[PDB]
Amino acid sequence: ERFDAFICYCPSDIQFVQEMIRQLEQTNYRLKLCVSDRDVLPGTCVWSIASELIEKRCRRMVVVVSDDYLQSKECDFQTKFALSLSPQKRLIPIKYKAMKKEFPSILRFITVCDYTNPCTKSWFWTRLAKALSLP
Amino acid sequence: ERFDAFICYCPSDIQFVQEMIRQLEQTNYRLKLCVSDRDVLPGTCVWSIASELIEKRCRRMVVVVSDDYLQSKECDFQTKFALSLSPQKRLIPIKYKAMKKEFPSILRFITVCDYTNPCTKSWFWTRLAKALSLP
Amino acid sequence: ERFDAFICYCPSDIQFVQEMIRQLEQTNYRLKLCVSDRDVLPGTCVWSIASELIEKRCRRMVVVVSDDYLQSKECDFQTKFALSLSPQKRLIPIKYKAMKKEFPSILRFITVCDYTNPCTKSWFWTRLAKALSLP
Amino acid sequence: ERFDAFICYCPSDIQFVQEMIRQLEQTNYRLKLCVSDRDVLPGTCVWSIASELIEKRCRRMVVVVSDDYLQSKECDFQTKFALSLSPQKRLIPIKYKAMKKEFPSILRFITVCDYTNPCTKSWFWTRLAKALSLP
Amino acid sequence: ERFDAFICYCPSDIQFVQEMIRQLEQTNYRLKLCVSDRDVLPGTCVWSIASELIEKRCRRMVVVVSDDYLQSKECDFQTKFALSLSPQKRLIPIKYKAMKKEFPSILRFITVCDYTNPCTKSWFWTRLAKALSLP
Amino acid sequence: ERFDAFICYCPSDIQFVQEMIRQLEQTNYRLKLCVSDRDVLPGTCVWSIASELIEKRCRRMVVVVSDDYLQSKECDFQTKFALSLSPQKRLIPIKYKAMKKEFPSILRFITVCDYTNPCTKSWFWTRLAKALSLP
Amino acid sequence: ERFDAFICYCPSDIQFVQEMIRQLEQTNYRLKLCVSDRDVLPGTCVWSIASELIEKRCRRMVVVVSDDYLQSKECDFQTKFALSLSPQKRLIPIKYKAMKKEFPSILRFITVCDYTNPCTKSWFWTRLAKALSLP
């Protein structure tokens, strides 16, 4: 029923989401993350997963930014529907890979949780799990 | 008499349907799937399998989308007759193979149950059997 | 509300439909023909004009067969939905022009009301108005 | 305050909107249409005109489809936000000009109110004003 | 002492500011606009006109966007200092000329008060004077 | 029976009258214009269309002035019969084309509704429909 | 009903009148100018626009002097009818273009509001709007 974070990801980047499940769910933190290919029954309509999941069930939204994120359209609509909801840091962008294109200009005024820097990798999962566990 | 899911498939893709029978009928789930080459006596008229089976006997319909699905016409009429029935997720599209053409534009607003992704194959049959077993 | 005949036509052949309105409605026969560009409000969904008009409101269906009829798809679905309804001569095909392609093979077992023959044109409108006015 | 129809249009097509104001507001129908360049004070935020105008103030939405409609992004987000609202024919697409590209595939299952056909122009404004005036 | 709107402009665009003084001050609206070359004594320090004028004296800020606006740095710092103040539509961007470069990406989520459109020029000054006169 | 405006035109200028029907009848104004080639049965006498139509049925008269208007005689007699009726602006002259002869000297003391000026074309149809709709 | 200034112009000079409407009506001055091709219904008599408009409705009269002004006769009669009314500066002549003929000798004892001088163009619209707004 309830969750803690909807996860918006391109389908070419599920190896990172499987890592996130291991680090945040199967660890001693006990967090619940709604993943689309795991908690959504087939046959649903697309306009209900924005009006029911992102609106009334999840509390935050994690945007897995990548290079193939800039080609899909459902991620664009879900990102803009999340930004349209503003009454608490309700949008967390994550960069994990070497991008060679431009960053999304919509997200330039939010602080990204970077992973590709080979000197700051000790603070990543602690900051992320402290962010998601906040009320 | 009654069923749980009509199955709409091209005749060049029955090796997958034979696998589906093994995974959903001969397993501990006990589901009943109406297959055309197994439960329809020869000599019937084509306009009765849409007015009697899909209307009053089956409860859902599973569309085995493929590359040779885009050439047959009975699958087109049965898909559109299923979409014309709307009073519950009464249409489940399944992709199982590497398609090289375009996806059907009629089905773009329903969530597909994908199988060709080599990282998500553990959730496939559980999601499908949880979807078909719903009232 | 009620009607007497739904009219299925390609949009490139409305000059004949305007003639049919003059010969069957504005004449001393007093028939009511549901035309799509005249009795359907914009904003409707396409899957309701087959489930409500052809099913429960009109009593027959007139198929204006032509050369550009073989390219549209909504006429194909409406023709096959009309043929799927069989409990009374509930489908009347009309040929009015010199076709250079093949006749539709779906309609070969129904008697066409031909118009292009320059010797039989006296019986056309009388036969058509006697057919449509039957209960 | 209240309205009857939000109007979604590309800024290169305001000559048609000025005609629509003359035919629907300054005529004997007395309809109120919220236009962006006429009723929105400058300095507003873009994410409030979807959460306040389209949600709680207007009752329907008129999409002026054109060739330059396929390049803007705010019309894409407003169209998809309108489609995401589904509890009454709450979306009316209008074609008024000779398009040379493809029609939008998102809107193929709603009936368009066509204007470029030189034989049906007598029914256009009557159908449109009967549609907008419905409760 | 008090004002109603600080005006941030490039020094190559004072002919428009002189027009704005005629249309908003010397007209029957009686508005007070703090202009830098008219109300600031020489010899002041630059870091006081942001901490005293924009903070505690003016109520809004009008950004005269142009092509030479993208080269100055004091306008960049004053724009970002205005955006950093967020407790009411406290920033009004104005476009008056044909720009050939890109719009500033910082201001894309605020509604611009456009002037170069040759069909909407009747609403410009009324909207602007209704915006500035609000409490 | 009743009308709003008799229309006096040379038979070489019916393409403009067909445009006038589209702009004033098939639009949201609902005006009725008596046209000779559309509402007069053949076999009538010419001296009754001036004693019955222009006298007791129509309320105004629209004179489509052109270059070939100066050759017909029935337009001369109908214009002079209209001028002989004076008890309200009961005669509206319309110029739509580049004339190379002289204007009619009989009509020099009435204000013409000009159309060939390429700067005033926005006011034409609004002025004409406001004139014809007056009691 | 009421106005502020009748405008007497040759029909070959309406591009300047369209500019005057933008500078005096659609600006923050809110003046009302009676233009003949915009506020006079067709079918009126010419001898009423001097006895009703210039006499009892407008308060001043603006004479757009030009080179083609010296060929029309209605401007001559309206100028002399305005001069015959003398009980307040009730006649304002405007020169805007390079004339190559002589100035009108009737108007030599009134001060012209010149526009073609490339050094005095800053005072033009302010003087004109201060003149027209006087009681």
Swiss-Prot record, chains A, B, C, D, E, F, G:
The modification Phosphoserine is found at S86. It comes from the Eukaryota. Ubiquitinated; undergoes 'Lys-63'-linked polyubiquitination. OTUD4 specifically hydrolyzes 'Lys-63'-linked polyubiquitinated MYD88. Deubiquitinated by USP3 that cleaves 'Lys-63'-linked ubiquitin chains leading to inhibition of MYD88-induced NF-kappa-B signaling. It is linked to Immunodeficiency 68: An autosomal recessive primary immunodeficiency characterized by life-threatening, often recurrent, pyogenic bacterial infections, including invasive pneumococcal disease, beginning in infancy or early childhood. This is Myeloid differentiation primary response protein MyD88. Changing K121A: Slightly reduced activity. The chain holds residues 159 to 296 of 296 of the full protein. Adapter protein involved in the Toll-like receptor and IL-1 receptor signaling pathway in the innate immune response. Acts via IRAK1, IRAK2, IRF7 and TRAF6, leading to NF-kappa-B activation, cytokine secretion and the inflammatory response. Increases IL-8 transcription. Involved in IL-18-mediated signaling pathway. Activates IRF1 resulting in its rapid migration into the nucleus to mediate an efficient induction of IFN-beta, NOS2/INOS, and IL12A genes. The intermediate domain (ID) is required for the phosphorylation and activation of IRAK. It is found in: Cytoplasm; Nucleus. Changing R38A: Reduced interaction with TIRAP, and strongly reduced activity. Strongly reduced interaction with TIRAP. Ubiquitous. Residues 1-132 form the TIR domain. Homodimer. Also forms heterodimers with TIRAP. Binds to TLR2, TLR5, IRAK1, IRAK2 and IRAK4 via their respective TIR domains. Interacts with IL18R1. Interacts with BMX, IL1RL1, IKBKE and IRF7. Interacts with LRRFIP1 and LRRFIP2; this interaction positively regulates Toll-like receptor (TLR) signaling in response to agonist. Interacts with FLII. LRRFIP1 and LRRFIP2 compete with FLII for MYD88-binding. Interacts with IRF1. Upon IL1B treatment, forms a complex with PELI1, IRAK1, IRAK4 and TRAF6; this complex recruits MAP3K7/TAK1, TAB1 and TAB2 to mediate NF-kappa-B activation. Coiled coil: none annotated.
